[model samples]
Target: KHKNMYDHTEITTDSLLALLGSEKVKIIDVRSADAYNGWRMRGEVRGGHIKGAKSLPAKWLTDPEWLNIVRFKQIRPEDAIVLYGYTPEECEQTATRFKENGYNNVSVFHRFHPDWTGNDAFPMDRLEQYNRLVPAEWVNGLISGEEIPEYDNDTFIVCHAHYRNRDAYLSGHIPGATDMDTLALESPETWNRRTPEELKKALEEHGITASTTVVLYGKFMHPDNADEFPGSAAGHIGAIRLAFIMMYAGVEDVRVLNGGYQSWTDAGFAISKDDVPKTTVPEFGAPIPSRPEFAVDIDEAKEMLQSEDSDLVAVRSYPEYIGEVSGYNYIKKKGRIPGAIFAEAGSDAYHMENYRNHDHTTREYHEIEDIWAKSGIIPKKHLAFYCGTGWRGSEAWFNALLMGWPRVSVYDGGWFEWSNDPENPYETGVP
Candidate 1:
């Protein structure tokens, strides 16, 4: 029984700083290899690390052979070990793993690399070619937006692509709804600028047209990051990405299923497994055209950040909003832009089990109306969204655009850039 009782610890900046001059503390850099090589803490206050900080990527600790790795280090179950990373999320995972593996005296530094490096309190070695810092606005607009009723259509419904979820679609889906996997909508594929004919064909296969009121849903819908609750496939960000693609492609009238499958079923709506009814691709209309007017970039974010009226929403997990975790492995920091409002986009919106439930469909008009009334976010105000990357922001932006809100944008680079840049200001640790 005593062996099972391990004391986990949490280290903070002030506590770590006090130990810098002493030899009793051991610091570990658990970020990925690319991150460590690109830019890291080095010399004194401006260039290096806090004396003898060892470099060990967190992956080594989580690998299947972690027990062997721990044994090789001769780490005892009772050693006082402090874990830190570019983001607090990774630190939590690392700390949790240590505890599970019987390391009783493990703790995580709440705000690791970002706080240390940004304040000019810790030393760092700058690389010649680091990952570019995309402005928070560009990434922000890529994530959130207003609900434009112009994009909705009965035939167009967003689908969660990737493995497993596709299998669900093959079995059944909403009647007359086309299958546009989240992957097809959000990633590099949608950005390739397909020709009008190609785009029209893709839309037609999913039973979409200019007038289609698209209702999007998918299998395994987590809110921000993948869940450990089992059976969850991916987060809602991927599907929202598809919504952005449609907007960028000039297809109006799109919206994600408001509660996802869970809400649909919960509302006693019908469920179907039949493939979406397909149609012949319409004759190439004047190239569907692009919407540069709706898109946003870095300058836009800076302006929004300074404005009291600007609506910059962060639609990620609470932990992510508080800078306690990160969804990406390459970035070496965590935290959100200053003054960002938090929205848990996936929760209350989708079903965790099968993606085909009608309960997961679009929210009732009244619900959207009520949310706006409670949050103080005017539907017509300029709205920008962001997440760990641009994914979840897109989900919230897509839903907003569906409900007739106006002036929306998604931040593509998101926190990945905001946290890495020492010049940009941010807030971390719960709320």
Candidate 2:
């Protein structure tokens, strides 16, 4: 009998499990994020990843900053790395990438499907409610008249979210999606979520109900600095903002198109300028703001500042965090909430490059978690993320929720409200 038929660069399920307990062994899942997060993407018997694996999708290898991402994940060149995915070819290809990048101790786990997933003895873990963030192919199936594997709902609606710019939605959108003005769920006067009655009516008018499976997406119109409303084109962030509000409003099944409209177009799906009409429902079917804890009011923010187990995260650009500019034209004040921890957003107020991929899909979950961990933003603490207004904050909050963080919320009245009150203490020039 042959002692071990596998090559030196390959590992069996038993060999992989033996190395799992080693702190130096870094297990990399080189599959789609949807697959890593419990989606049965390729007819696998089970979903999710091997319990301790960190996600670094094979698709991300095309990224110019892939090495930076590896550094961000803290995977040093000296670590014993094991790569696994849907196929042996992908695992070997990713192992080659690691070796070419000076990571020598790399091996491929070739029996991830039948040998690992098919056996109940193997341990696996996934984000709670991971399906809430849908991939483009899953969405394409639904809109293209095919029923997907995980979706069991009878009714669904795809929303194209925009700020005040309806033209963004009018130009190009998913084939049968209706447009949603951000104003419907939030107020211009405060830039916070609207009143419960207002949210109820607005959601009903858009055909949303508590039990409906709602898929939302938006276009990234590339904001121009000279434009009056640079954020007007940042509808992808607006789409996430709408997702946050809907979850807070008690929508049972809310999903965001992973990379917004960009994913649809990238997949070479058909676009429609036909301006699909909305199907208004009679009732929203649940009480508005059922998840009140998802939002932190001004008083709660102030109280969180004094709590031992709370972290107030400032999700904004560096200039905005240090009081150089307010990050918004309408906002007059330019200081951060006293005692807030900085979590960078992007180069400017209109971008979320830090939390999104080059294509604007949510960035690697493991990367975000590591970044937050270094800044005392662990899931154990009650976290409240905020930015100049609430757009960026909502996006950050959604990321935390997608990670299965237990206590996370958007500080609804962010810099605008914090700096509005003369009595509140504000700081400048970094903490």
Candidate 3:
């Protein structure tokens, strides 16, 4: 009889039972700290950490701390590591990470917690660390002099991030809101990400210095020139593009105004016409692009694409993906990466509308999961999501992270970078 498992080496429940009392056997629980500490999600019967399992989360693998902090401190190469999470696949990913980091002996747990619940014999740990993603009500409270953790006057509200849509900012924005041209974080030539030092200059110029909280939301301008493009019309994509960049660019505490500016105005909050305050600090506190956790260059994507395990995700309109129409004006060639997995972001350029509610908050989590799942966009695979110039791609990549796809990155250069190279091949039809 086969125990359900991925192809990786696994630590069976029986084997784990034997190693329970051994110091040499380090079992890593890779879920959010809350879940490991026994906090019940929507319908769980009970919540608690695994017996003797340490609380090193898998997402940390993408953080700078994985090598600088986790590797040197908690784990040793000599120890036998058993990784487990909500699923065997997740555990496998963590196991792969440990192996990649030079851990000689690592294995995965076959059955996940949903199947292993209430096994009271295992020891459990608890700690209350709440989830991220600030709700609109909380933001409104913070706006109206109510107290909330990690928010303050130094908290800068920002907008005008989608494709240099300054018209949106000039029109109106959140109170004390500032403008951020997303292109500033990218190279002037291609829509590729900027170098570290260049990025630092952009952040500091925006008054995002060593110590500041960044609050971002979209104030999509009216589409006066949507027809400038071929078949597609411009839509309000919000600040997700900038949010992902600033987060990757090393802003310690970044939060999105949920539902975005639309929700704020819908709820009748105050608006503003102010620009970003000037800054005295010479540069930002953190290293430019403190990590490559969120973005990937083309070469990195090319190397990963060679592996069948990595998924090249196309988060764009069906017409754009299939070459019926080009998403961007400069992109003369149509179709996708030779072997990309096409995941229609929406039916048209207005696809992002489907991902949100009428108030503009992100759609429900399961709804997002279902939307992506239809195109085999599972969390298990390492994903490289790309669109025309990296705006839509960045938004899609942001959603992937929001959906908790652990090993995901955005191809920031996207089609603009890909199409410019004459040697890069293209195909017109679906794979």
Candidate 4:
């Protein structure tokens, strides 16, 4: 008779299925978050992961916050653990980590892709439109000149998005990536998107057409710098802001690096300092602002406030939501839009700690969804996210868009434009 309940540390598919939702058991997907989010990274029969599995990617083990993440995932040492990935090595590696952390009852499930995913009977779940949130491996392959999956376009641009700082791109960026300033896509005065014509010019100058596959990323280098273009310092959020504008300007294939530039370095890919120049294009293939609804103007924003089927989400820090500070140097008004729901960004204006992980990767999608669901920020509604300006709001908006939420938009004229008008009512101290 077998001494152990399972095959030592290796768990068979049948055994895993039995332990699926047991309170004593915890299923950890030791694969890339992209894979867990439903990306077919390995060209499996189906994308996504086993039902009830929590994402704890093997790649993140090197991070100092790994144990913290374990606890945050509610993974207890006393719980029976099961790990799964594309390879046995990955499974074993993660299982070993679990054991090292005092999780004695850890097991590995090897045949997740071909065996589990291939079988339609096996229950699994995935994020909607997870392909838009790309992993580092995909970006590396694309830039390395490899023909990648899900991308059919020949003309593509890799943009290292920053605010006004070229040095961020100059310091270290992905090879073959061009530099783009956030200012090129947004108006400094209003902090909203530029005019359609201005957007056309910028897109043309950046060699971006409606069909062009553009991948954008930013370096999160402690973006709280109070000197010399502070907005540029929050490059990751700024990159998403640029992505939002590009999408609004009719760029059909806009992809954001899931974890930003940090993911590239974390993947052990070589970074290039070359300032790659943009290849200017003559025509922009399609009419600008083709997706105008993606940006909610102040007029539409006010209307949404009164609609029960819509919500105005305030994506800012706690203090900013309570009117402690305006959250921007140029902006003076210190309260949230009267009808907006609070979706905290982070500790301050520049950081999106709530939306991102310690490694600067996007947070778990289900977690975000669950939190929003509790606050009545459901997908059935027309959700518009906003911040003090538009940067943090764009980041939150991008996350929802990537999640494949149908009616998500950026309240482009965020607090900057709304608060500037004295007539607009504002609230402080938690609604």
Candidate RMSDs in order: 20.0, 3.4, 14.7, 2.4
| Residue 178 lDDT, candidate 4, scale 0-100 | 92
Per-residue lDDT for 1-431 in model 3, tens only?
43223346767777788888999988877865435534453235546556677756665666655665455335788888888887777776677667777777778887646555656565555432222345545566665677654355555544445455666675677665667766677665886777888878878777786356676776644443245632111323536666677778888776666556666675577777766565535669887677576887788778767877787777778888778887765568776777777767766654565454434445434446666788778888888888877766766776667555778888887777877888988778754
Alpha carbon lDDT of residue 175, candidate 3?
A: 67
Model 1 lDDT tens row, 1-431: 24332334668788877776554455665654334433232221322233445445665663576676555444556556776776667766666677787777666776655567667655444322221111112111222342221222223334433322555466555444445554333333222234545566676665556655444555543434343322224433345465575666666554454333443344344566776545645542334645544445556877887787776777666556566666444445767778766665543222212111122333322334455557766676787876655655665565566445667777665776566669988888876
Total clashing pairs in model 3 = 5
- List lDDT for all candidates, in order: 0.52, 0.87, 0.65, 0.86
Runs off by more than 4 Å, candidate 4: 1-8
Candidate structures ordered by TM-score, highest first: 4, 2, 3, 1
TM-score of every candidate: 0.47, 0.91, 0.65, 0.94
Model 2 lDDT tens row, 176-203: 8999999999998888999999999999
Name the better of 1 and 2 by TM-score: 2
What does candidate 4's lDDT look like per residue over 1-431, in tens digits?
A: 43343333678989888878798888888888888998888888698989988888887888888998899878898998888888877776677667677777877888887899999989999988787888999998887789777788787889999988999999999998899999898888888899999999998998889999999999988865466566677788888889899998999999999889988998899989997888899999899889998999899999999999999999989989899998877887788888788898899889988888787888888878888888898889999999877788889998898778999999988888898899989887755
Which residue pairs in candidate 3 have backbone atoms (N, alpha carbon, C) closer than 3 angstroms, thus clashing?
38-47, 38-48, 51-123, 259-360, 259-361
After best superposition, candidate 3 residue 114: deviation in angstroms? 25
Q: Which wins on TM-score, candidate 3 or candidate 4?
A: 4
Q: Candidate 2: which stretches are off by over 4 Å?
A: 1-8
